[PDB]
Amino acid sequence: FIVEDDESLGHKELKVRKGHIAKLMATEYQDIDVEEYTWSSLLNEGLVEYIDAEEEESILIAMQPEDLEPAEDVDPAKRIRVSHHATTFTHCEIHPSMILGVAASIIPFPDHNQSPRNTYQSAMGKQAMGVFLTNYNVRMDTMANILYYPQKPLGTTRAMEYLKFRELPAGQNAIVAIACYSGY
Amino acid sequence: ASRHGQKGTIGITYRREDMPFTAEGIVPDLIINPHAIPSRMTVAHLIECLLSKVAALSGNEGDASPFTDITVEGISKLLREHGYQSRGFEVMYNGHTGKKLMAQIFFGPTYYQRLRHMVDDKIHARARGPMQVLTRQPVEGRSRDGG
Amino acid sequence: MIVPVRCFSCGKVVGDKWESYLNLLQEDELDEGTALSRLGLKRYCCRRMILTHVDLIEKFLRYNPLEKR
């Protein structure tokens, strides 16, 4: 995202407003007759900008627009999220959860795990068994495994909405009991 | 496998009348060892199970995005409001004798993935078989009945 | 791919309860939880049966059949 000087509010503020969000939702709902408003509109009107690893050296980015942007009681269970005590941001993250990979976005709460376990899943979710394509009946793949009843996960991630994981699942919601029942 | 690297083979299969059960009659699909959780420090399996239980009760799929403001206390309050214990434990009963289990069992739905390493594609036996053309020694591979 | 006939845990028949659930969501503007509760699925083991099922045959049946009479 782009942070402007924004002299109206007297502090740094993102260029995107609720109007652009409403227009994006309107286009997203018309696709599923209004004026088309897609990612090219955000890219061409200065609302978002492409930053590579070169420009990340000489910029300053914020986690959330709702916390690190405005000038500053706390929940006893919420994590300590620092606001960096400085409001001079020139860019803002669209969402931090988009630092993950594809099969590492399958993990429910990857920040609540030890990182080797996230690596083991992200190299193990490829090894899962489930429906891969919807035309598996007409494909002569050398090996193919299809679950009978693939169920979309109960605890899901927003990121797998765009990965079509709820449309093509790779597992089942098993009733897990964490117990030492018989020693097997 | 879980969605947290908690892979493992099937130890044994019990029928329903042997395998333990809660007071609501819900016999679990799958019993996992407690000792696998804290050595690996896998907490997201527990929170995923709690959120999935709340999602199954309320009928709305649970958000498990990494960096949201969703804590264990809120999910615990929702599970308490749905009529179960706040931390997900249920008082279950032994299947063999019907006596209550002295310790309460963490319980609930959790997304598991079946992995391709079936036992049928890995079992191997050979008493005698085809030898190699070069060294007169048993051949490579389980498809060719090798050593 | 289509709805299982029975809950794997408890065994209550839910294969006849899928089109009713889709009917309740489609035209009555209901939440999923209340519609699931009205079908008599009070245990969450049966609730993850209908809530979490994806209807894959709606994507399967769009292909033409291999043999047509």
Binding site: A26, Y29, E161 | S58, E73, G74 | -
Partner: peptide
């Protein structure tokens, strides 16, 4: 605490009501 659910169907109904 915030609601830990993905309920976009009610968001769909609310946005179609807004339009």
């Amino acid at each position: 605490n915030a609601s830990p659910f993905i309920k976009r169907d009610r968001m769909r109904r609310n946005f179609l009501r807004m339009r």
